[PDB]
Amino acid sequence: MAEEWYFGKITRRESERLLLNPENPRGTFLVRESETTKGAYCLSVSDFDNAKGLNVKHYKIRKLDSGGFYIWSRTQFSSLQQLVAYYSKHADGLCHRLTNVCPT
Amino acid sequence: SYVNVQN
């Protein structure tokens, strides 16, 4: 479907390398396949910590039978685009709203 | 290491 924020089959280390770029504003993000569980995905986002510096938080996106995806079971979605659209307007669990697509 | 997964 070609969404710029979707990187697919990249490792976690690859996702942190892209997100830990110093030019990324807080809330920069991407969605990728889980590097550990077949069928699962992940939302990786950038944030800053005074003591340690730039950091990346990873959220496991579970994919149901069934269709559907969710970070927390109380807020579910029919697709990955719907999930990103939502969190792009409401943190609702996240430390911050998804602010910017991570540059490829 | 995922924020939403305790275990």
Contact A42 B2 (CB under 8 A): yes
Method: X-ray
Please report, for chain A, the start and end positions of each structural domain, with discontinuous segments joined by +.
Answer: 1-104
Q: Name the burial class of residue A1, with classes exposed (0-12), middle (13-18) and buried (19+) by CB atoms within 10 angstroms of its CB.
A: exposed
Element (H, E) at A57: strand A53-63
Q: Provide the 3-class DSSP secondary structure of residue A16.
A: helix
* The listed CATH number (3.30.505.10, 3.40.50.300, 3.30.1490.100, 3.30.365.10) that belongs to domain A1-104: 3.30.505.10
Chain B contact for A62 (CB, 8 A cutoff) = no
Cis peptide before A66 (omega within 30 of 0): yes
- Whether A84 contacts A62, CB under 8 Å: no
For residue A32, the chain B residues in CB contact (below 8 A) are: none
How close, in Å, is residue A12 to chain B by CA atoms? 10
